[PDB]
Amino acid sequence: LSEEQQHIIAILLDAHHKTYDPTYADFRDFRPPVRPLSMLPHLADLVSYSIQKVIGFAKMIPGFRDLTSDDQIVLLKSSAIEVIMLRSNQSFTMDDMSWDCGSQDYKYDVTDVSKAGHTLELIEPLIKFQVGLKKLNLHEEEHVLLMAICIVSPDRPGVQDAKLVEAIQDRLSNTLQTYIRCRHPPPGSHQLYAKMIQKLADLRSLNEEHSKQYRSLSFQPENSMKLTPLVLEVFGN
């Protein structure tokens, strides 16, 4: 575990502590939850707020700001929803399979999110992903590395410079691999790196399902009205 990679882990931890509020104080600013697509204005506000936080995290990733402005946008458009699902694992609890954010009120279950349309085709695999991510019992250092590796992916559609993206991801991947050996003891570290990259593959199919869900729902202007301008810009055309 080198000079350079302890620097990286310190940066990502601080970046996360600045972009994820464990007290969830800003939830008062959202449009109120009502439990029709009753919850969508509240969840749209939650997602929109979370995209801002994901962007703030991404900008602090060592090597990210050295990318083009255009490559940064490509990486955030494709990765935003995936990092949101990753970072939501902190609020997700396995007592009742819900995201618990202080009150409830601000706690969300499958009935809160899968009532309308074909959204269960996304929610059922997403809950299973949350359970699977939770059973990894990640160190916080591993949690923030995985989000950063998720953001800086060289295979996102539309990436121009990919070698540099790969270079930035490799230095994060090799930080995660070396961290698991030196800091994660057995048996919890057994194939832990392979199980984490597997969760990156789960995010890809959850992202693909998400794009199909969003496209169908945004196609109805009545529901697109309830979203936010940021959400529409990022989850785009």
Binding site: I55, G56, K59, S69, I73, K77, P229, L230, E233, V234
Partner: peptide, 10 residues
């Protein structure tokens, strides 16, 4: 073509 996202970068 992403005014808000570009502004959230810098």
């Amino acid at each position: 073509n992403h005014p808000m996202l570009m502004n959230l970068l810098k």
